[PDB]
Every structure is written in C-alpha cells, then in structure tokens.
Design a protein around this ligand. Sequence first.
Ligand SMILES: [K+]
Ligand SMILES: [K+]
Ligand code: NA
Ligand code: NA
Ligand code: NA
Ligand code: NA
Ligand code: NA
Ligand code: NA
Ligand code: NA
Lengths: 122, 120
Amino acid sequence: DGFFKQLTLPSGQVVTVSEGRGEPASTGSYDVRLYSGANPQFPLDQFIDGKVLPRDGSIKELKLLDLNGDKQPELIVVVESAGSGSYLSADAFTLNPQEGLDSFNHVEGLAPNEDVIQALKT
Amino acid sequence: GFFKQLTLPSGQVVTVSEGRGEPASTGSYDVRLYSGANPQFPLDQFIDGKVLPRDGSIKELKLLDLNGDKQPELIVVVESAGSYLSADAFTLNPQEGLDSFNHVEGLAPNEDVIQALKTP
Ligand SMILES: [K+]
Ligand SMILES: [K+]
Ligand code: NA
Ligand code: NA
Ligand code: NA
Ligand code: NA
Ligand code: NA
Ligand code: NA
Ligand code: NA
C-alpha cells in the first residue's frame, strides 16, 4: 500500500488523501475524497465527492488552514519535487458541509523557501 | 477493495479502484488514465483521473467502442448490494484525455448494459 492519510475536519466531515496505486514515488497523481463523517465509528461510510490531481513529486505535508476567511480550514496538499532543487507545489481545496469539495487554488514551481500559504492566498 | 489495470491497444493504461477503507456496499471509485508511452512502465505518465460515486460494488470493467469511432470507451459496471445494475462509460484518448460518455442506472440483472449506454 502507498500513501494514505485520513483527517477529520472541524465540521465532523472526513477527508482522505491517497497517492495513486502502483505509481512511482517521484511522480504521478493523488486523490482527495470527502465523506460526511456522520458516524465517527465508521467515518468512511458516506462518500460525498472526490478529485484526482497530478503530483510533481511526493506529498510532503497536509495542512488544515483557513485561507479564505470563512473560519473553516481549507485542505492544503504540499508536494515536493524529486529534483535537486526540491521545488514545491501545492493544491488547496475547500471542503465544508454547505458546498462539499471544490478546488480553491494551485501553485507550482516554488523555491523551497517560498511562503506556500501566502502563495495559495494570492 | 477493487483494483484493476487495463491496457488499451493504443498503449494507454487505465486503473480503476474502489475507495480505500469504504464499505463493500457503497462508496466511490476512481478512474486514472496514463499514457503508457513506455509499456514497461505503465503507470509512469499520469494524464487525468475522476472520482465517482458507486451505488454498490464494481462488478466488472469493459473496453468497447460505444460511439463507432473505432476507439474503445471504458465501462464500469456496478452491482447493488441488495437486484439492479448501473454503469458509467468514459472516453479515453491521447488527444483529449478522460471524459464522461454516459451513465445508466436501475437496470435489471438480465438487461444489456452496453446497449443501454449506446441508446439515447
Ligand atoms: K462541490
Ligand atoms: K479531458
Ligand atoms: Na507511505
Ligand atoms: Na512531470
Ligand atoms: Na476557509
Ligand atoms: Na468556500
Ligand atoms: Na456542486
Ligand atoms: Na470545482
Ligand atoms: Na469509441
């Protein structure tokens, strides 16, 4: 099994993030799947929506931070290139009970010392 | 959890997966398309993917030309945990990528899913 992480949002919704099965470490895809989380004992029983995105590198971090000021965290998936420069890219998603899952922003080709969060707000 | 890889005669590669950790009876599946440009590395060149709901468990995959352009579409057939079939079809090509072709649902087990997907 490859990369898999499950997070519970403040609303009680549950999100999973996976890299594509059978893919190389250096490049491929990942998906984000949102669930209602209505029963925390069976958090993945009620699927809502999902997206598949390319990754130029490996997932390096998952962050839950409010980017748009609505008080709820967006999900940020930070990806680090296998290149010697370790260039960063990231996708942000809104995920909430009212709207479900949507893309918020995407950045790529960032130097390792760049402010990814500020870039995603830009 | 369902996982299957198919390779088209063009060389394109597709994988179909049920969502990890989900119930057998309900959840999601994803379809991922790769170029397969180097056939020894089928999953080295990702193109595009989609995540869909499944009302049931994946029964089988088919590759068949649904619109008569001589390229195969991908069909994902789903069986309810209860008896009904549903199915989603997708176009796949190097030129365009991955797109929805059609969707059918509430079919009897004996019905022709492929003819249903072809029929306006
Ligand atoms: K949405
Ligand atoms: K497309
Ligand atoms: Na891992
Ligand atoms: Na690339
Ligand atoms: Na927010
Ligand atoms: Na929003
Ligand atoms: Na919508
Ligand atoms: Na969207
Ligand atoms: Na066709």
